[PDB]
Symmetry: D2
Subunit: 251 residues, 4 copies
């Protein structure tokens, strides 16, 4: 395709799972990809190596999210790492993908667990986007990775759903504000998606059967929607919540 | 009416504005109302006096929200204050009404301001509801006061909208979980509503014109919807987001 | 209550099922109710007798819907029947309740069946509302009875869902247009509701289990929401789609 | 791209406006395109010539919609026209694009005008899709062109909005039913879109300002979304309503 030819992307949690698929798709389409991660240096190196092997350009960016100064640390590492590539500052495509699950229903959730899922899932994207506005170019793309669970009730993950619900609400407000500069802002909401990290054949069967297609999502199913949203082909789609669940919750 | 005859209600921020209208309507309909507040002891006393003057029963409950132990402190004060009324423990109707605004667009929002609006608007209701489940009776009512701004983009208040968006997502998950005990969970979303705390005749005109009725909301417009949702007449309405904006954002 | 004291209501298909519950609730609250029907004169007489027995005022209005001149015939019979009561012309509350089911999936639907369900369910309400605007008073109420099936996919009734989907879209446009005269327009969407016309204990169990409350709806569950929407208590709710399904489709 | 290489598409009203842009985009990507139309033989010939000139394959299909036997006549002409191309029967991609406007508010709409807009906009697509199920292949695509007006109230076009609202409701029901064969069903909803058929500079300015981008849509903006939805890249998007309005109605 090369529909991201000459563009700079940042993918938060780009090292594994959906983030890795997004990182690899954007790079395969000609983007220079900042592969961000908080913990696993090795995973981040393999993902960059995979991209470089396939003929694309990527570099790691280390910043732990959900801690004091996380957003500032991420953009400092990005600016440094990016500068060290001999590219100019700023970016075209921001994907807030990094997130953590909290599989506890309301009676189980502690303050510590609640505070951590909001800090990573909601607070970090909010301040990451805030500082991106210093760097984000005209005709740019902001894409938040949310969850189908904001629109289909899942009591077992309620605090996680709420953290993604707050994130969903950032999209329309920013689409409106950034429209005059040709920037689009959109949410892509995955369903049950099979990553490198669904061992129970029984859970696998129940989650598969939730899709009208009778399968789990793959990272690639999400990355193919994100790549479209990030492209010029989606210039007329803004402020939206794009279901990437294989028809979960239809009937 | 007396459709809340013999029921115990808690209204968070019940001392002024929409909370006061809710408190007074529930009490006028026969509810015993816990009028909760964080700061203004005087306001809380006037509101209880107004209810007692009109023939109803209410008592103040002091707890500052958005601070360590807020939810535990609120339920301790409720249990104590309630016990001191010579009523039994527990409750029928929980209204999470207390909230604070943050009128700053994304480029303006500080960590401190963001953290405070989430702590009061989202975190406190979440842990308040969690501890209510020890006390909340069969056929009970949970009602969250949200904002029209979660569904109609208002960049100027983006972090406030996000805090209400997280709260919106708690409603369906809890409606599903609590259905088997006849409890309903619903969100009521006010529009531009004129409280005791809209001095600019120009802002007043612009916000009035947002309604298909060409006026600002009054606390009473919200309280009349909340009272219905809290009643047996709304037994078949659960998990919903009830627009109480006078038709803001229709076209 | 008497919250409809001195008001004139028309309920289409008011003779049985949800229409009968609406008719009886509005009359019990002091409304003069036009009980409209297309076919069963006897049912319409029993419903009016039931209202008159309980101390309320109602009269039958015969008009077959889904035929040439149906809307004109209904308003002619209403104006005549109403005039014969010695009340003045016009009305306060219009409920489009009359409808027919089409339980055939897409591969089964004939032109005749499709045309008939649209004629009764969509076309008749549209022209009925059009002629109501000559008669409908300030502060009035228009309420459409839709179906949960417009928002939760039910392939087995697809053409019926589409007919209700068109009806759903009339509500916001009219709420906007009629706001300046204090008229509200709203949709109430029933779920699986047990009428006089669910014999299979197996279908009964499956439809019951669709509700978070583990029961079928009763006409009264719908009528209690409609009566609220029709009242001054709902003056600030307009253009909305009110779920009256007992939490069908939440998760 | 060639992401429609070897696929057969039918585009209803493919001869001009959005239909022509869709027809040309699908053909440029390797689809064999049936360019359907009801009236203007010349327009249909120019559109096919444009495609053939650019290196693609298309053929005209004449059928007037909104008349007795329209769906049967369209598929007879398609099967004949298609057969005459020396391709096998059946298809991969169905776009219901053909539609007519009705710019009259409720007080203005006649039975004839109402009946005609439903016949073309709703009835024809419904029976066209019904007969497509005899021909539509595994992994296929059904795409309905709706209107932003189903979700943002436009009293001036109310009967048109209702016709598109019924069409919107066909999408989820069919997505659910056809999921097991890998077929996706989606609605694409254009905003104010500038076609060959917006002469008033004043209307042009007002409609432009409705978009967060301060311009009218172009056919190409819609065609780029439709082409994505029709492709393997959108395999995980089904039952959805895709806003192609340039952010109309966000705030
Ligand atoms: N998989 C699924 O079924 C679903 C996924 N989602 C959402 O999709 C997104 C991607 O999920 P998925 O692919 O499953 O996740 P994985 O857990 O597979 O990958 C998570 C990524 O985020 C990074 N990350 C995690 N926590 C932090 C942190 N505190 N600071 C910095 N980076 C962090 C990880 O790097 P590192 O380990 O080095 O920190 C890694 O790159 C998430 O937002 C998730 O909520 C939504 C619906 C369901
Ligand atoms: N008015 C409007 O136009 C709109 C209102 N809303 C929402 O409606 C709800 C009611 O708003 P409104 O009537 O305007 O508010 P007011 O500010 O008039 O009243 C706020 C109430 O909440 C209490 N409260 C505030 N902060 C705290 C705190 N930290 N701890 C404990 N109690 C607290 C206040 O008591 P004390 O001062 O003693 O702390 C008071 O009783 C809020 O959730 C608001 O966001 C939504 C849309 C618009
Ligand atoms: N019951 C349920 O589970 C559900 C009901 N609904 C909707 O709720 C509404 C009420 O349904 P319900 O109570 O079950 O219906 P019933 O069939 O019990 O009652 C139908 C009523 O409409 C009248 N009616 C029917 N067809 C015509 C016609 N052609 N002309 C004039 N009057 C007519 C009937 O009178 P007569 O027989 O004399 O013509 C009768 O008063 C309908 O719009 C229905 O689609 C939606 C979701 C599910
Ligand atoms: N343009 C806009 O701003 C908007 C458009 N839309 C929708 O997008 C779709 C495309 O609209 P647009 O490009 O503007 O339309 P145009 O009127 O430019 O093109 C209409 C097309 O449909 C065909 N058509 C029209 N009526 C019939 C009929 N009775 N039988 C058969 N074919 C027919 C026409 O061919 P022929 O003339 O030969 O019959 C032509 O190919 C429509 O469904 C429209 O409602 C929605 C929102 C706004």
């Amino acid at each position: 395709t090369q529909r991201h030819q000459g563009r700079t992307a940042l993918v938060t949690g780009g090292s594994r799972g959906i983030g890795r698929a997004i990182s690899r798709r954007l790079a395969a389409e000609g983007a220079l990809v900042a592969v961000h991660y908080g913990h696993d240096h090795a995973a981040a190196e393999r993902t960059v190596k995979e991209i470089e092997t396939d003929g694309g350009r990527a570099f790691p960016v280390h910043a732990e999210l959900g801690v004091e100064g996380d957003a500032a640390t991420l953009w400092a590492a990005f600016d440094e790492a990016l500068s060290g590539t001999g590219s100019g500052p700023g970016l075209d495509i921001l994907v807030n993908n990094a997130g953590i699950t909290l599989p506890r229903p309301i009676a189980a959730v502690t303050e510590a667990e609640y505070d951590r899922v909001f800090a990573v899932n909601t607070r970090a994207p909010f301040f990451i986007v805030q500082r991106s506005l210093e760097r984000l170019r005209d005709g740019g793309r902001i894409i938040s990775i949310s969850s189908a669970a904001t629109q289909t009730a899942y009591p077992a993950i309620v605090a996680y759903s709420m953290s993604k619900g707050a994130l969903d609400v950032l999209t329309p407000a920013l689409a409106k504000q950034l429209g005059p500069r040709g920037i689009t802002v959109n949410t892509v909401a995955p369903g049950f998606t099979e990553t490198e990290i669904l061992s129970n054949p029984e859970i696998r069967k129940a989650l598969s059967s939730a899709s009208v297609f009778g399968r789990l999502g793959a990272p690639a199913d999400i990355a193919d929607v994100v790549s479209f949203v990030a492209s010029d082909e989606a210039r007329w789609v803004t402020g939206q919540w794009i279901d990437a669940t294989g028809g979960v919750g239809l009937g």
